[PDB]
Amino acid sequence: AHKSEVAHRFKDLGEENFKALVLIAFAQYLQQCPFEDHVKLVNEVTEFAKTCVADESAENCDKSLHTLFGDKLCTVATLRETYGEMADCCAKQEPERNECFLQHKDDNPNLPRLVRPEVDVMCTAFHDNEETFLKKYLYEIARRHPYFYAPELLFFAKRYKAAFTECCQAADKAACLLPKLDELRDEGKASSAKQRLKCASLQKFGERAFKAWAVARLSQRFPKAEFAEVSKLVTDLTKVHTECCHGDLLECADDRADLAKYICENQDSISSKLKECCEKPLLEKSHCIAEVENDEMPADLPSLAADFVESKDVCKNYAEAKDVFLGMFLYEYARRHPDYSVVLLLRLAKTYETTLEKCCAAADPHECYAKVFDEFKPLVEEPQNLIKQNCELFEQLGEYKFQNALLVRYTKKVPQVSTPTLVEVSRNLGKVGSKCCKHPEAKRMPCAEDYLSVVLNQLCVLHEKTPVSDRVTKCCTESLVNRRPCFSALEVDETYVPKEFNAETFTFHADICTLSEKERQIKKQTALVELVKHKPKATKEQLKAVMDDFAAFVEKCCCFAEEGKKLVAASQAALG
Ligand SMILES: CCCCC[C@H](O)C/C=C1/C(=O)C=C[C@@H]1C/C=C\CCCC(=O)O
Ligand SMILES: CCCCC[C@H](O)C/C=C1/C(=O)C=C[C@@H]1C/C=C\CCCC(=O)O
Ligand SMILES: CCCCCCCCCCCCCC(=O)O
Ligand SMILES: CCCCCCCCCCCCCC(=O)O
Ligand SMILES: CCCCCCCCCCCCCC(=O)O
Ligand SMILES: CCCCCCCCCCCCCC(=O)O
Ligand SMILES: CCCCCCCCCCCCCC(=O)O
């Protein structure tokens, strides 16, 4: 409702942030334009912005942000030659022009791998012209991730900027930097697979599924809030998520900032943990809030049995308004259990619902639903037990060999997944082990759910459109809370015909000695999957015996071709 919207945004964000976000937003629409062209356009938009700051009444200062972006986009002179139909958007009036740009954000980019320079070269470059070096990489990530919400991409950039400061100075520029950059990469990976999971989930499962999830997550977060307040938050969050998924950066950022403002003007009835977030500038407020730790729950909440099992009014209260009642149940359950994953809370509410449907229909409903809590039993135990055993295995073996145990396990279940994907999914599950198994027990399930749900959804995006397995499509298109259970119930594939021996696959040279850590790991792991694909029936003593001998073939050789010939020979018979 301001006179100059571009001026208002520039005085609030601050110039450095405004330039960064302008660069991100243009790079996400104009993906094939070279860095220096985006620089020129940024400088132009920034300079016009300043005229509005100095005089809100200056020409064109009163146009909306949408109009000004669209107008700028339509002055790029090679728009049609490079973008084709996207130039057709320019002929259209603004409500419509802006919708048209939205439908044309490419997403298969098609760009070439971004190779990390050598550390020596990045530090050098960071030092000689810090902004070009950072800004160019923001541009590179943004054009390769055109749906990544722009302020979050800016928040990560500030993290890289921090890291180069830190490390481009000390005794070793590899023992400071590399593990920071590697942690930033996995974490950026997650953040992005996560935004796509939220949006695709809303389509597949519906607003109702989505809302159940939010009731649960926010009840865990704000266990002191009243249900009515939790429900108002999920209704507004639902609408935000919905606008953000439609994709218009300004509209998403407006709704998110409105929700932030509400949250902060109501801290006392939501959470004693919001003080710091609610002091942050607008740009980081909502982001801080979505990341806040769970508040402490209030002391000695009653058990759930009274309102949900014991009351004579159960069926009556349910049937008046079934979703509100199930949402009260889910709220009451989740506030008590910061330690459950959200999907387990859903599985629990969905169980309570299936039980009230059957039983409320009976002459004596109470006798029928009297044991429902006992049904929550094994639902809770199952994920806790799988987590417990996998962290113990992880403790017993360490990451790389845990990764290896995960390879033979998953290759036997779904041998017809390609070798790189199996390698990839297993190295990554190993990372979820090493990050989640450091939580005590009462944090492990929420952790595990976070990362696995990310890892599985991408699994499921790959598979779709490159289908190799009916059992993977089954798990990938299951309901939301059934997905991870479905993968977990996968057994060793008894259908699978062994891959025929391939001579080249188990022949290695001197290189493996000299390549890096990682790459030697991938190479050995590729071979191992290949090993399992050829003898799907190998027992574990037999695999180990063969793995110990590969490491002894590698150990003493660094004889690659004649021994390897008898590495193979000996192996094809300890497995024959
Ligand atoms: C062997 C690949 C190494 C990593 C890939 C490059 O470093 C790009 C850098 C990214 C980043 O930082 C965040 C997201 C992208 C990568 C994600 C998906 C690419 C798949 C579809 C596509 O990009 O065509
Ligand atoms: C992404 C922050 C915005 C600006 C951050 C710094 O400019 C980056 C500087 C880099 C560097 O010097 C070497 C590698 C990174 C780029 C890496 C991956 C791209 C996508 C990975 C992801 O999804 O974060
Ligand atoms: C398509 C043109 C993009 C407009 C430039 C970005 C404006 C900055 C929005 C940042 C506000 C974030 C609000 C929030 O996420 O809580
Ligand atoms: C797999 C997704 C469905 C999970 C739903 C299980 C039963 C809980 C229903 C909650 C309905 C949303 C009502 C609300 O809490 O606002
Ligand atoms: C911390 C476990 C290391 C990673 C290995 C895979 C184990 C999967 C445990 C599943 C818990 C999922 C949450 C849920 O579905 O309720
Ligand atoms: C493409 C499917 C190959 C298997 C790779 C990951 C399988 C899903 C794992 C989910 C976490 C482990 C599930 C489990 O073993 O209980
Ligand atoms: C029939 C071919 C026999 C050689 C193929 C064996 C592949 C062994 C990979 C095992 C590496 C995991 C343990 C390690 O890196 O030391």
Swiss-Prot record:
Residues bearing the modification N6-succinyllysine: 204, 435, 518
Record's keyword annotation contains Calcium: yes
Site location (Not glycated): 3, 19, 40, 63, 72, 92, 105, 135, 158, 173, 180, 189, 194, 204, 211, 239, 261, 273, 285, 358, 371, 388, 401, 413, 431, 435, 465, 474, 499, 518, 523, 537, 540, 556, 566
SMART domains given in the database record: ALBUMIN (SM00103)
Modified residues (N6-methyllysine): 533
Site (Aspirin-acetylated lysine): 198
One Pfam family recorded for the sequence: Serum_albumin
Tissue: Plasma.
Chain residues that bind Ca(2+) 1: 5, 243, 248, 251
Protein name: Albumin
Species the sequence originates in: Homo sapiens (Human)
Name of the encoding gene: ALB
